């Protein structure tokens, strides 16, 4: 599987940008490793 | 697949803590579903 973080800015080291996600009905980055 | 949010107020009822995370140099719950 995949562990993904829904982040307010960009993705961390070694994380993949796996499209976007929503938090508080606002666009965020889906960062997965 | 797991999607995790670093939440200022804590985890939704359908989420579960999964350790902590940092946000604005402050410690918060990491909440995943």
Residue numbers in the entry:
A (entry chain A), B (entry chain B): 3 to 35
Task: Show sentences the authors wrote.
Mouse α-defensins, better known as cryptdins, are host protective antimicrobial peptides produced in the intestinal crypt by Paneth cells. Mammalian defensins of 2 to 5 kDa in size are rich in Arg and/or Lys residues with three intramolecular disulfide bonds and are classified into α, β, and θ subfamilies according to their disulfide topology and sites of expression. Cryptdins are initially synthesized as inactive precursors, i.e., procryptdins, which are proteolytically processed to their active mature forms by matrix metalloproteinase 7 (MMP-7 or matrilysin). Based on sequence variability, the 17 cryptdins identified from a single jejunal crypt can be grouped into three subclasses: Crp1-like, Crp4, and Crp5, of which Crp1-like peptides are highly similar and form the largest group of cryptdins comprising Crp1 to Crp3 and Crp6 to Crp17 (29, 37).
However, only the structure of Crp14 has been determined by X-ray crystallography to a high resolution of 1.67 Å. Crp14 adopts a disulfide-stabilized, three-stranded β-sheet core structure and forms a noncanonical dimer stabilized by asymmetrical interactions between the two β1 strands in parallel. Arg9 and Glu17 form a salt bridge that is conserved in all mammalian α-defensins. This salt bridge rigidifies the first loop connecting β1-β2 (56, 66) and is additionally stabilized by a Lys14 O accepting H-bond from Glu17 N and a Lys14 N donating H-bond to Glu17 Oε1. As shown in the electrostatic potential map, Crp14 is clearly amphiphilic with a cluster of positively charged residues well segregated from a large hydrophobic surface. Crp14 crystallized in space group P6522 with two Crp14 molecules in the asymmetric unit that form an apparent dimer that is different from the dimers of other α-defensins with known crystal structures. Crp14 dimerization is mediated primarily by interactions between the two β1 strands in parallel, in contrast to the dimers of other known α-defensins that dimerize via the interactions of the two β2 strands in antiparallel. Four asymmetric main chain-main chain H-bonds form the basis of the dimer interface, i.e., Leu4a O-Leu4b N, Cys6a N-Leu4b O, Cys6a O-Cys6b N, and Cys8a N-Cys6b O. In addition, Asp3b N donates an H-bond to Asp3a Oδ1 and the side chain of Tyr7 packs against neighboring disulfide bonds in both copies. However, the total buried surface area (BSA) for both dimers is similar, 724 Å2 for the Crp14 dimer compared to 744 Å2 for HNP1. As shown in the dimeric structure of Crp14, the two side chains of Thr10 directly point toward each other, 8.3 Å apart between Thr10 Oγ1 atoms, such that a T10K variation may be energetically unfavorable for cryptdin dimerization due to electrostatic repulsion.
